[PDB]
Design a binder for this molecule. Structure first.
Ligand SMILES: [Mg+2]
Ligand SMILES: [Mg+2]
Ligand SMILES: [Mg+2]
Ligand SMILES: [Mg+2]
Ligand SMILES: [Mg+2]
Ligand SMILES: [Mg+2]
Ligand SMILES: [Mg+2]
Ligand SMILES: [Mg+2]
Ligand SMILES: [Mg+2]
Ligand SMILES: [Mg+2]
Ligand SMILES: [Mg+2]
Ligand SMILES: [Mg+2]
Ligand SMILES: [Mg+2]
Ligand SMILES: [Mg+2]
Ligand SMILES: [Mg+2]
Ligand SMILES: [Mg+2]
Ligand SMILES: [Mg+2]
Ligand SMILES: [Mg+2]
Ligand SMILES: [Mg+2]
Ligand SMILES: [Mg+2]
Ligand SMILES: [Mg+2]
Ligand SMILES: [Mg+2]
Ligand SMILES: [Mg+2]
Ligand SMILES: [Mg+2]
Ligand SMILES: [Mg+2]
Ligand SMILES: [Mg+2]
Ligand SMILES: [Mg+2]
Ligand SMILES: [Mg+2]
Ligand SMILES: [Mg+2]
Ligand SMILES: [Mg+2]
Ligand SMILES: [Mg+2]
Ligand SMILES: [Mg+2]
Ligand SMILES: [Mg+2]
Ligand SMILES: [Mg+2]
Ligand SMILES: [Mg+2]
Ligand SMILES: [Mg+2]
Ligand SMILES: [Mg+2]
Ligand SMILES: [Mg+2]
Ligand SMILES: [Mg+2]
Ligand SMILES: [Mg+2]
Ligand SMILES: [Mg+2]
Ligand SMILES: [Mg+2]
Ligand SMILES: [Mg+2]
Ligand SMILES: [Mg+2]
Ligand SMILES: [Mg+2]
Ligand SMILES: [Mg+2]
Ligand SMILES: [Mg+2]
Ligand SMILES: [Mg+2]
Ligand SMILES: [Mg+2]
Ligand SMILES: [Mg+2]
Ligand SMILES: [Mg+2]
Ligand SMILES: [Mg+2]
Ligand SMILES: [Mg+2]
Ligand SMILES: [Mg+2]
Ligand SMILES: [Mg+2]
Ligand SMILES: [Mg+2]
Ligand SMILES: [Mg+2]
Ligand SMILES: [Mg+2]
Ligand SMILES: [Mg+2]
Ligand SMILES: [Mg+2]
Ligand SMILES: [Mg+2]
Ligand SMILES: [Mg+2]
Ligand SMILES: [Mg+2]
Ligand SMILES: [Mg+2]
Ligand SMILES: [Mg+2]
Ligand SMILES: [Mg+2]
Ligand SMILES: [Mg+2]
Ligand SMILES: [Mg+2]
Ligand SMILES: [Mg+2]
Ligand SMILES: [Mg+2]
Ligand SMILES: [Mg+2]
Ligand SMILES: [Mg+2]
Ligand SMILES: [Mg+2]
Ligand SMILES: [Mg+2]
Ligand SMILES: [Mg+2]
Ligand SMILES: [Mg+2]
Ligand SMILES: [Mg+2]
Ligand SMILES: [Mg+2]
Ligand SMILES: [Mg+2]
Ligand SMILES: [Mg+2]
Ligand SMILES: [Mg+2]
Ligand SMILES: [Mg+2]
Ligand SMILES: [Mg+2]
Ligand SMILES: [Mg+2]
Ligand SMILES: [Mg+2]
Ligand SMILES: [Mg+2]
Ligand SMILES: [Mg+2]
Ligand SMILES: [Mg+2]
Ligand SMILES: [Mg+2]
Ligand SMILES: [Mg+2]
Ligand SMILES: [Mg+2]
Ligand SMILES: [Mg+2]
Ligand SMILES: [Mg+2]
Ligand SMILES: [Mg+2]
Ligand SMILES: [Mg+2]
Ligand SMILES: [Mg+2]
Ligand SMILES: [Mg+2]
Ligand SMILES: [Mg+2]
Ligand SMILES: [Mg+2]
Ligand SMILES: [Mg+2]
Ligand SMILES: [Mg+2]
Ligand SMILES: [Mg+2]
Ligand SMILES: [Mg+2]
Ligand SMILES: [Mg+2]
Ligand SMILES: [Mg+2]
Ligand SMILES: [Mg+2]
Ligand SMILES: [Mg+2]
Ligand SMILES: [Mg+2]
Ligand SMILES: [Mg+2]
Ligand SMILES: [Mg+2]
Ligand SMILES: [Mg+2]
Ligand SMILES: [Mg+2]
Ligand SMILES: [Mg+2]
Ligand SMILES: [Mg+2]
Ligand SMILES: [Mg+2]
Ligand SMILES: [Mg+2]
Ligand SMILES: [Mg+2]
Ligand SMILES: [Mg+2]
Ligand SMILES: [Mg+2]
Ligand SMILES: [Mg+2]
Ligand SMILES: [Mg+2]
Ligand SMILES: [Mg+2]
Ligand SMILES: [Mg+2]
Ligand SMILES: [Mg+2]
Ligand SMILES: [Mg+2]
Ligand SMILES: [Mg+2]
Ligand SMILES: [Mg+2]
Ligand SMILES: [Mg+2]
Ligand SMILES: [Mg+2]
Ligand SMILES: [Mg+2]
Ligand SMILES: [Mg+2]
Ligand SMILES: [Mg+2]
Ligand SMILES: [Mg+2]
Ligand SMILES: [Mg+2]
Ligand SMILES: [Mg+2]
Ligand SMILES: [Mg+2]
Ligand SMILES: [Mg+2]
Ligand SMILES: [Mg+2]
Ligand SMILES: [Mg+2]
Ligand SMILES: [Mg+2]
Ligand SMILES: [Mg+2]
Ligand SMILES: [Mg+2]
Ligand SMILES: [Mg+2]
Ligand SMILES: [Mg+2]
Ligand SMILES: [Mg+2]
Ligand SMILES: [Mg+2]
Ligand SMILES: [Mg+2]
Ligand SMILES: [Mg+2]
Ligand SMILES: [Mg+2]
Ligand SMILES: [Mg+2]
Ligand SMILES: [Mg+2]
Ligand SMILES: [Mg+2]
Ligand SMILES: [Mg+2]
Ligand SMILES: [Mg+2]
Ligand SMILES: [Mg+2]
Ligand SMILES: [Mg+2]
Ligand SMILES: [Mg+2]
Ligand SMILES: [Mg+2]
Ligand SMILES: [Mg+2]
Ligand SMILES: [Mg+2]
Ligand SMILES: [Mg+2]
Ligand SMILES: [Mg+2]
Ligand SMILES: [Mg+2]
Ligand SMILES: [Mg+2]
Ligand SMILES: [Mg+2]
Ligand SMILES: [Mg+2]
Ligand SMILES: [Mg+2]
Ligand SMILES: [Mg+2]
Ligand SMILES: [Mg+2]
Ligand SMILES: [Mg+2]
Ligand SMILES: [Mg+2]
Ligand SMILES: [Mg+2]
Ligand SMILES: [Mg+2]
Ligand SMILES: [Mg+2]
Ligand SMILES: [Mg+2]
Ligand SMILES: [Mg+2]
Ligand SMILES: [Mg+2]
Ligand SMILES: [Mg+2]
Ligand SMILES: [Mg+2]
Ligand SMILES: [Mg+2]
Ligand SMILES: [Mg+2]
Ligand SMILES: [Mg+2]
Ligand SMILES: [Mg+2]
Ligand SMILES: [Mg+2]
Ligand SMILES: [Mg+2]
Ligand SMILES: [Mg+2]
Ligand SMILES: [Mg+2]
Ligand SMILES: [Mg+2]
Ligand SMILES: [Mg+2]
Ligand SMILES: [Mg+2]
Ligand SMILES: [Mg+2]
Ligand SMILES: [Mg+2]
Ligand SMILES: [Mg+2]
Ligand SMILES: [Mg+2]
Ligand SMILES: [Mg+2]
Ligand SMILES: [Mg+2]
Ligand SMILES: [Mg+2]
Ligand SMILES: [Mg+2]
Ligand SMILES: [Mg+2]
Ligand SMILES: [Mg+2]
Ligand SMILES: [Mg+2]
Ligand SMILES: [Mg+2]
Ligand SMILES: [Mg+2]
Ligand SMILES: [Mg+2]
Ligand SMILES: [Mg+2]
Ligand SMILES: [Mg+2]
Ligand SMILES: [Mg+2]
Ligand SMILES: [Mg+2]
Ligand SMILES: [Mg+2]
Ligand SMILES: [Mg+2]
Ligand SMILES: [Mg+2]
Ligand SMILES: [Mg+2]
Ligand SMILES: [Mg+2]
Ligand SMILES: [Mg+2]
Ligand SMILES: [Mg+2]
Ligand SMILES: [Mg+2]
Ligand SMILES: [Mg+2]
Ligand SMILES: [Mg+2]
Ligand SMILES: [Mg+2]
Ligand SMILES: [Mg+2]
Ligand SMILES: [Mg+2]
Ligand SMILES: [Mg+2]
Ligand SMILES: [Mg+2]
Ligand SMILES: [Mg+2]
Ligand SMILES: [Mg+2]
Ligand SMILES: [Mg+2]
Ligand SMILES: [Mg+2]
Ligand SMILES: [Mg+2]
Ligand SMILES: [Mg+2]
Ligand SMILES: [Mg+2]
Ligand SMILES: [Mg+2]
Ligand SMILES: [Mg+2]
Ligand SMILES: [Mg+2]
Ligand SMILES: [Mg+2]
Ligand SMILES: [Mg+2]
Ligand SMILES: [Mg+2]
Ligand SMILES: [Mg+2]
Ligand SMILES: [Mg+2]
Ligand SMILES: [Mg+2]
Ligand SMILES: [Mg+2]
Ligand SMILES: [Mg+2]
Ligand SMILES: [Mg+2]
Ligand SMILES: [Mg+2]
Ligand SMILES: [Mg+2]
Ligand SMILES: [Mg+2]
Ligand SMILES: [Mg+2]
Ligand SMILES: [Mg+2]
Ligand SMILES: [Mg+2]
Ligand SMILES: [Mg+2]
Ligand SMILES: [Mg+2]
Ligand SMILES: [Mg+2]
Ligand SMILES: [Mg+2]
Ligand SMILES: [Mg+2]
Ligand SMILES: [Mg+2]
Ligand SMILES: [Mg+2]
Ligand SMILES: [Mg+2]
Ligand SMILES: [Mg+2]
Ligand SMILES: [Mg+2]
Ligand SMILES: [Mg+2]
Ligand SMILES: [Mg+2]
Ligand SMILES: [Mg+2]
Ligand SMILES: [Mg+2]
Ligand SMILES: [Mg+2]
Ligand SMILES: [Mg+2]
Ligand SMILES: [Mg+2]
Lengths: 275, 48
RNA sequence: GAGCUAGCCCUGGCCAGGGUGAAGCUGGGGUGAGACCCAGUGGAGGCCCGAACCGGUGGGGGAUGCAAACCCCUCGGAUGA
RNA sequence: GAAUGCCGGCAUGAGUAACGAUAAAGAGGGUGAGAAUCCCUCUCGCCGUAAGCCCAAGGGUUCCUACGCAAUGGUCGUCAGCGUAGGGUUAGGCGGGACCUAAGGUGAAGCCGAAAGGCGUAGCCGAAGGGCAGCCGGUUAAUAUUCCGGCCCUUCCCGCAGGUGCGAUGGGGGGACGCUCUAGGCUAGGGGGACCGGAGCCAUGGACGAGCCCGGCCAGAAGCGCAGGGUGGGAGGUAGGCAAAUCCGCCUCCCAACAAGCUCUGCGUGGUGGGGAAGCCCGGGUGACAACCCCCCGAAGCCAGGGAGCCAAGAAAAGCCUCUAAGCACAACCUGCGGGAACCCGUACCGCAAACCGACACAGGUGGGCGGGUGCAAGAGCACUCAGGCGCGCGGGAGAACCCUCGCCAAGGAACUCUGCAAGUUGGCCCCGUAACUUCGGGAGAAGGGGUGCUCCCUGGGGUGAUGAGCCCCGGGGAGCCGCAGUGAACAGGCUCUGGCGACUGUUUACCAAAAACACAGCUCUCUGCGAACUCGUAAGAGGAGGUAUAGGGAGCGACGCUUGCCCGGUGCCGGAAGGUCAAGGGGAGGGGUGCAAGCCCCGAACCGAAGCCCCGGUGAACGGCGGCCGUAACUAUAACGGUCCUAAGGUAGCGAAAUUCCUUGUCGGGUAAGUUCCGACCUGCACGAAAAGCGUAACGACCGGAGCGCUGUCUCGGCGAGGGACCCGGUGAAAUUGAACUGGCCGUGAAGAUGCGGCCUACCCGUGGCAGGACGAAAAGACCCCGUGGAGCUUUACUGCAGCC
RNA sequence: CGAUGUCGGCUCGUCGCAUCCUGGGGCUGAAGAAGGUCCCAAGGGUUGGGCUGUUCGCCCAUUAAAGCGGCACGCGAGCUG
RNA sequence: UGGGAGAGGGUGGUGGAAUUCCCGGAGUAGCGGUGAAAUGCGCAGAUACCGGGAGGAACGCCGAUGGCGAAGGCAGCCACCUGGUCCACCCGUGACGCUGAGGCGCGAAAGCGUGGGGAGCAAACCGGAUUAGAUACCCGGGUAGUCCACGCCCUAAACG
RNA sequence: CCGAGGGUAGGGCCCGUGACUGGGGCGAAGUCGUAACAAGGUAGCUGUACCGGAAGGUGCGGCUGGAU
């Protein structure tokens, strides 16, 4: 869990890498991969719409099963646990007794060789998917649909989880990884357990180069530019912001809320995120 | 040093060529214009 | 108009030779079991020296130039952002 | 007659600068009207990881031959990439198309936009990626994997035989993949041979030799051999691969497993087809029945889709194989053999350059492969040299100043100067040895030394082979020889102490700044619940992201260490269903116009009425801010203490004459003979201070300071020498500039600095090499400065709008 | 202002004299030696370093002395920067 | 060998009381706080009362002058894993013992690193009083920390 | 060959001294406050943490060498 290096270069001092001790299979399932179109943060106009992106390692996209209500009742075996460079979590290879193979994202504690299954009758067991309606109150859960049959939307980053606080009517009450209290529909699926690779957040990139490998190009501060570029541009020598700190596009960036006020989901958010 | 003209027959025909001109409205008014003026060639000649 | 230049995308190519010697593994020692120590093996690194390649630090020359940015000596990077 | 006018023509500078890398020339013989310059020969020098050779791009006849020399060629020209004419580019296998997909482009369906048009699934296009059948020699003045010769191979059509449930744009398998390191066995290439073939050669003192010099191969179908890659067999069940399925996937059972077998490549061999040197003789002919063998080195290439490790986790589609469905089983497909069929485009030549990009036959720029030998530890480094290719399209003299590039220097050794700028010194390898400090890696090539050649003798280990010889590779010991000197030539660190800034490798103002700037891992704040926020777009649609709070946006800060205090009164943001204000709308007390009137028409109070603002709170790693005066201790001085005025609160730790200190070279101490700089301190900090972060910090730095050692032409202080220019001669022959000129000094005068006016002095006419004081010398209608109700970029609590959001 | 290059240094001088030294004097509160002050005099001479961009100034070691000013704050078609 | 008592230790689970906050209801002019007050909070609907929810920490009565441990120290309840210890029987070994410089391990609180977690409490800090002053005692707030995991620190009126 | 020692270079220990700086001891009658000894007028002592002109205060946990 997080390997360290001796300081035999200036960057190996702090650089840490994952232990990869859970991975059992070091090459992907040929039938479950497809090319990932690297965009560089450029839209169909060719315009950079998200700055500072590009230049990262080539990746194959692994098709992930975020429904699991496709195969209600059909058990699967845990065949392997694999690297996925498109997400922070690890992924899990399932050999269904159907003979079909799919990927899910690996919850914490899932062991290769285990049987998993999905549906209302399913056991409350790490890796099983049920509608939220049927999971006991108080159970930690992950990969949660936000609406019925629309696909797992919540709590899939490494180490994340959502806890079931209670239910009312057709809806259950979840505590999201952010701490928001939200009602989610009881028919929405979810997988009991928390996402694996919890130590993911304790990784120290160590040097600029690792950012470049992840497709992250250098980010240049506003205070470093000229007035034609940014509200914080200009000044003789260094300079404080000299105005409410702002984005490149004018708007304030220290506390200004930006959620849409009349958004129809407000009726289902019970409490705004903690901390 | 490296100068600005680096000829390229594919780049030339695809950028200034007859069919590139005919695709866009400003491309056609170019040909229209050069036809009106009596240009001997409406488009850069390139060997292919 | 991006055949210059800047960034990104797709697909290929290049990086003489030498130097240092991380993790791991093996054996030995150690202990209740360990941490750990030693030797061997090993060959990591925006590691070291240095051609190609990419640069342009100091000085001299050139200044109706060989050249609308060049030449000489010197110098930086050279498995990597 | 003037517009730095416009167009052209012709002058001046001037027979002046220059004639484009300092790799270099000399003679003889030809040709011709004419020759330093063209051809031939001999001698000399230059490149040789190229300055040689082969591809690609771009160029487009420049290629070959004949006949030419007006112009082009920096001179000449009989020559030429120039002029005229004729000739020259040959493919089923090479490259591209009749094949496939990548980004991207286009785009039936569909969506969007005043118009023009913008999107968009499939599909289509799109290559230097995937896929696919030709190798060796000969021939032409000029093409050749293209013609020819030899030996092989692919596809399509039709036929014959044998075989099988045949059949696809649908299902599946495969194609199919990174980085670093790397095994075995080969081949490319190379070194050697006392072996094999060769025309010869004996010089000048010696050698007739196990002498010198030259060469000792290339291609090849089946088969076979060595080395590899790939690959389990059978059965039963089956609900999954959007129909089917005997295929694939999943379960079970049996047998086989570092094998074997089958299959596919590489290398070797292989019938056979080629090639074949020096030297001599006129590209050729001979040599020659040429010989064509043995040993060693050996790839980064081959076997290959090999192996191991690691994280940043490494295209697609077709060919191909298999499964089947419609259909069809007179079929159709598979295998073997045979005949026939096989189209379009490129192919000349240059290609690190005189043919490409730079206006030039321009010291610049241009992607891929081959790139031999010896020595130097290695190598593509360096020196010389092979094959090959050149002497750079003005020359001949002379041997001044001065300039450039270079060599040396007595004594001194930084005294030079803003500065050791520059140039010395050091310099590779092996061995000995190596400090503070430190994040324990480092600092480190620290520093400082010793060794280095040749000869003879003794000897250890490895590779090949066989275990031995030979060859090759690492070494160990002893005795000697020579010189000033043994990395004897060439290539190859000067070192140390101490500050500032920045953690570091990186990045930048293409063309005056490479830095202390930008970036950067890391820290914090903040927004964002997913049709996310945010961004581009009128929109549709995209990016975000096929991601989901361990995630994505924004902002500041900038490894790490120890830390980051007090102020919420104002501005910002956040919270606040009350109150205050508030537009359109609602409401209609009450008025007005008009009509005979019913009516029509107009104004209009109270009152209801959002956001925003007011108001009440919160909030600093939000914008920001963090006092003044007077007095006081038993020497003096200074105030722990106190008084009072003000504030939203009065600067904490740490640091401080600093990249900040004005007075300032503050004062004291160190260093020096002497120190406005430097280092260490003090603290009245003009005008440090805590993420516009404060204080430190090992390592790192073409950053900027100060010192020391070493060593020097930097200097006292200059001298001599070399080559390339300058100078002279023949050839070719510019430029900016220019009112005209018959163009001296002084002292005055003048629009205030006179060759040109006055007075005086001096002065025969014309050049050449030189120096720069003047011609307010040239260049550019001053960038500074001001003026113009000139312009543009930028800012905000300037005005007024607009997008966007509410 | 259709341009008169702006500090200092180096190099190269040349002039003035209100003289720093050397030569000639008078007065002295000049015994001598050595000074002071003033007059005449521009022939010649007027050093090397540390600091700073510096001119200037201070300092070290000397000296007969270590002069002051002008020449576009002399001199960038002479150099530096 | 057969038995016993125990907050000895580690892991996971779980139970109710209370406090704070959130939502709903009902209700009104104060609540709070002290020596006395003020700050603070409350008509924008607090305090007091009822129902519901979230979360943390500590375990009332038993409880004792009690028990366990070498010491530090250990207290709801359940299970698992584990140490020490006492009694009985008189069964086995036959001095196998005592101590212990160095070594190693454990070691309250506070404190440190990286993640969490955060109800109450509370250094710092802010505010109200008191006072000549009040950088205190008292009151209203309040950040580290107190809690969990891993890793350090290794101190004590670590005392009988 | 060894060899007194000389020279070049780098280390280790000790002593003296140094602008300035840190606390310490001592000093007949200084300034500020009153922490401790009585419950010393907030029981004290304590290890540690943070803070403050100064003694000290406060948190956390500990000791009685704490009174009633
Ligand atoms: Mg690390
Ligand atoms: Mg370490
Ligand atoms: Mg893992
Ligand atoms: Mg696929
Ligand atoms: Mg994508
Ligand atoms: Mg598009
Ligand atoms: Mg477009
Ligand atoms: Mg963006
Ligand atoms: Mg981008
Ligand atoms: Mg992710
Ligand atoms: Mg993963
Ligand atoms: Mg829902
Ligand atoms: Mg992180
Ligand atoms: Mg990446
Ligand atoms: Mg980032
Ligand atoms: Mg940045
Ligand atoms: Mg800026
Ligand atoms: Mg800037
Ligand atoms: Mg712009
Ligand atoms: Mg603007
Ligand atoms: Mg702006
Ligand atoms: Mg600004
Ligand atoms: Mg600025
Ligand atoms: Mg400033
Ligand atoms: Mg700036
Ligand atoms: Mg700021
Ligand atoms: Mg400001
Ligand atoms: Mg702003
Ligand atoms: Mg917005
Ligand atoms: Mg929320
Ligand atoms: Mg360029
Ligand atoms: Mg051009
Ligand atoms: Mg180009
Ligand atoms: Mg082209
Ligand atoms: Mg092309
Ligand atoms: Mg092109
Ligand atoms: Mg186009
Ligand atoms: Mg076109
Ligand atoms: Mg049109
Ligand atoms: Mg039209
Ligand atoms: Mg034309
Ligand atoms: Mg025509
Ligand atoms: Mg055109
Ligand atoms: Mg290009
Ligand atoms: Mg390289
Ligand atoms: Mg070495
Ligand atoms: Mg290993
Ligand atoms: Mg490197
Ligand atoms: Mg090195
Ligand atoms: Mg360059
Ligand atoms: Mg240069
Ligand atoms: Mg130099
Ligand atoms: Mg120039
Ligand atoms: Mg050059
Ligand atoms: Mg050079
Ligand atoms: Mg170098
Ligand atoms: Mg290097
Ligand atoms: Mg290298
Ligand atoms: Mg006139
Ligand atoms: Mg004009
Ligand atoms: Mg004109
Ligand atoms: Mg003209
Ligand atoms: Mg004419
Ligand atoms: Mg003319
Ligand atoms: Mg003339
Ligand atoms: Mg002349
Ligand atoms: Mg000239
Ligand atoms: Mg020239
Ligand atoms: Mg040259
Ligand atoms: Mg040469
Ligand atoms: Mg000759
Ligand atoms: Mg000749
Ligand atoms: Mg003739
Ligand atoms: Mg000639
Ligand atoms: Mg001639
Ligand atoms: Mg010739
Ligand atoms: Mg060579
Ligand atoms: Mg051309
Ligand atoms: Mg001619
Ligand atoms: Mg001629
Ligand atoms: Mg003619
Ligand atoms: Mg000519
Ligand atoms: Mg020419
Ligand atoms: Mg031809
Ligand atoms: Mg052919
Ligand atoms: Mg056809
Ligand atoms: Mg296609
Ligand atoms: Mg259209
Ligand atoms: Mg196309
Ligand atoms: Mg195509
Ligand atoms: Mg192709
Ligand atoms: Mg590929
Ligand atoms: Mg082909
Ligand atoms: Mg062949
Ligand atoms: Mg041939
Ligand atoms: Mg098929
Ligand atoms: Mg594959
Ligand atoms: Mg793949
Ligand atoms: Mg990698
Ligand atoms: Mg071969
Ligand atoms: Mg060899
Ligand atoms: Mg089936
Ligand atoms: Mg192959
Ligand atoms: Mg013959
Ligand atoms: Mg290679
Ligand atoms: Mg391969
Ligand atoms: Mg595709
Ligand atoms: Mg039939
Ligand atoms: Mg068959
Ligand atoms: Mg055709
Ligand atoms: Mg050809
Ligand atoms: Mg060629
Ligand atoms: Mg070149
Ligand atoms: Mg090339
Ligand atoms: Mg040529
Ligand atoms: Mg040019
Ligand atoms: Mg030439
Ligand atoms: Mg050229
Ligand atoms: Mg090149
Ligand atoms: Mg050879
Ligand atoms: Mg070498
Ligand atoms: Mg020449
Ligand atoms: Mg040349
Ligand atoms: Mg020439
Ligand atoms: Mg001469
Ligand atoms: Mg030269
Ligand atoms: Mg020499
Ligand atoms: Mg000599
Ligand atoms: Mg000398
Ligand atoms: Mg010296
Ligand atoms: Mg010396
Ligand atoms: Mg010096
Ligand atoms: Mg000098
Ligand atoms: Mg300088
Ligand atoms: Mg040297
Ligand atoms: Mg050297
Ligand atoms: Mg030292
Ligand atoms: Mg040092
Ligand atoms: Mg240090
Ligand atoms: Mg160390
Ligand atoms: Mg060494
Ligand atoms: Mg050395
Ligand atoms: Mg020796
Ligand atoms: Mg010799
Ligand atoms: Mg070096
Ligand atoms: Mg830096
Ligand atoms: Mg920087
Ligand atoms: Mg710093
Ligand atoms: Mg730092
Ligand atoms: Mg680098
Ligand atoms: Mg620049
Ligand atoms: Mg510039
Ligand atoms: Mg420029
Ligand atoms: Mg420059
Ligand atoms: Mg700069
Ligand atoms: Mg640099
Ligand atoms: Mg920058
Ligand atoms: Mg940095
Ligand atoms: Mg940080
Ligand atoms: Mg954070
Ligand atoms: Mg926009
Ligand atoms: Mg997407
Ligand atoms: Mg940094
Ligand atoms: Mg930065
Ligand atoms: Mg430290
Ligand atoms: Mg405030
Ligand atoms: Mg406030
Ligand atoms: Mg405020
Ligand atoms: Mg109204
Ligand atoms: Mg302000
Ligand atoms: Mg303010
Ligand atoms: Mg007094
Ligand atoms: Mg304070
Ligand atoms: Mg503090
Ligand atoms: Mg100071
Ligand atoms: Mg000072
Ligand atoms: Mg400072
Ligand atoms: Mg400064
Ligand atoms: Mg300051
Ligand atoms: Mg100062
Ligand atoms: Mg000053
Ligand atoms: Mg001084
Ligand atoms: Mg001193
Ligand atoms: Mg002072
Ligand atoms: Mg500052
Ligand atoms: Mg600042
Ligand atoms: Mg430092
Ligand atoms: Mg340092
Ligand atoms: Mg650097
Ligand atoms: Mg630097
Ligand atoms: Mg210096
Ligand atoms: Mg020095
Ligand atoms: Mg000289
Ligand atoms: Mg000469
Ligand atoms: Mg002539
Ligand atoms: Mg001519
Ligand atoms: Mg005249
Ligand atoms: Mg005249
Ligand atoms: Mg005259
Ligand atoms: Mg005259
Ligand atoms: Mg006047
Ligand atoms: Mg005059
Ligand atoms: Mg005159
Ligand atoms: Mg006149
Ligand atoms: Mg007159
Ligand atoms: Mg006159
Ligand atoms: Mg006159
Ligand atoms: Mg005269
Ligand atoms: Mg002359
Ligand atoms: Mg002359
Ligand atoms: Mg002159
Ligand atoms: Mg001049
Ligand atoms: Mg003049
Ligand atoms: Mg004038
Ligand atoms: Mg002048
Ligand atoms: Mg002049
Ligand atoms: Mg004008
Ligand atoms: Mg003007
Ligand atoms: Mg101008
Ligand atoms: Mg300017
Ligand atoms: Mg200006
Ligand atoms: Mg003015
Ligand atoms: Mg005005
Ligand atoms: Mg006016
Ligand atoms: Mg104006
Ligand atoms: Mg002017
Ligand atoms: Mg003019
Ligand atoms: Mg002018
Ligand atoms: Mg006298
Ligand atoms: Mg006397
Ligand atoms: Mg006397
Ligand atoms: Mg007198
Ligand atoms: Mg005189
Ligand atoms: Mg001075
Ligand atoms: Mg001056
Ligand atoms: Mg001064
Ligand atoms: Mg005297
Ligand atoms: Mg003067
Ligand atoms: Mg004057
Ligand atoms: Mg002047
Ligand atoms: Mg003046
Ligand atoms: Mg002046
Ligand atoms: Mg002057
Ligand atoms: Mg100048
Ligand atoms: Mg000057
Ligand atoms: Mg001038
Ligand atoms: Mg300057
Ligand atoms: Mg300069
Ligand atoms: Mg009230
Ligand atoms: Mg009310
Ligand atoms: Mg909570
Ligand atoms: Mg239980
Ligand atoms: Mg017994
Ligand atoms: Mg004991
Ligand atoms: Mg504790
Ligand atoms: Mg108060
Ligand atoms: Mg009072
Ligand atoms: Mg402890
Ligand atoms: Mg006790
Ligand atoms: Mg001696
Ligand atoms: Mg007390
Ligand atoms: Mg008391
Ligand atoms: Mg008291
Ligand atoms: Mg007390
Ligand atoms: Mg306190």
């Amino acid at each position: 869990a997080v390997k360290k290096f001796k300081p035999y270069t200036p960057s190996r001092r702090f650089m840490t890498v994952a232990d990869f001790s859970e991975i059992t299979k070091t090459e992907p399932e040929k039938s479950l991969v497809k090319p990932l179109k690297k965009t560089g943060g450029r839209n169909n106009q060719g315009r950079i719409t998200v700055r500072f992106r590009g230049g990262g390692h080539k990746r194959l996209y692994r098709i992930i099963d975020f429904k699991r209500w496709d195969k209600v009742g059909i058990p699967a075996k845990v065949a392997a646990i694999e690297y996925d460079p498109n997400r922070s979590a690890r992924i899990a290879l399932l050999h269904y007794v159907d003979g079909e193979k799919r990927y899910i994202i690996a919850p914490d504690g899932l062991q290769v060789g285990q049987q998993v299954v999905a549906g209302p009758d399913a056991p409350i067991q790490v890796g099983n998917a049920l509608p939220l309606r049927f999971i006991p109150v108080g159970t930690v859960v992950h990969a949660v649909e936000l609406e019925p049959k629309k696909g797992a939307k919540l709590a899939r980053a490494a180490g994340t989880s959502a806890q079931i606080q209670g239910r009312e009517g057709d809806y259950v009450i979840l505590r999201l990884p952010s701490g928001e209290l939200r009602k989610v529909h009881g028919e929405c699926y979810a997988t009991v357990g928390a996402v694996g690779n919890a130590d993911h957040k304790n990784i120290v990139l160590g040097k600029a180069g690792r950012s470049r490998w992840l497709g992250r190009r250098p980010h240049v501060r506003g205070a470093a530019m000229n007035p034609v570029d940014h509200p914080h541009g200009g000044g003789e020598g260094r300079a404080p912001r000299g105005r409410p700190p702002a984005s490149p596009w004018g708007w304030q960036t220290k506390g200004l809320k930006t959620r849409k006020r009349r958004k129809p989901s407000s009726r289902f958010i019970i409490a705004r995120r903690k901390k | 040093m490296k100068r600005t003209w680096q000829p390229n027959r594919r780049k030339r025909a695809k950028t200034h060529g007859f069919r590139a001109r005919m695709r866009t409205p400003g491309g056609r008014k170019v040909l229209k214009r050069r036809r009106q003026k009596g240009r001997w060639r409406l488009t850069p000649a390139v060997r292919k």
